[PDB]
Amino acid sequence: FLPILASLAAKFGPKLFALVTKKA
Numbered sequence: 431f432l433p434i435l436a437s438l439a440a441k442f443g444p445k446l447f448a449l450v451t452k453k454a
Contacts, residue, residue, distance in 0.1 A: 440447060448454030 444454075
């Protein structure tokens, strides 16, 4: 749900993005 802020989170949340993908 809330699909807008997922695009924002993918730029302003690299902290989450590295941890979920685990390849940073």
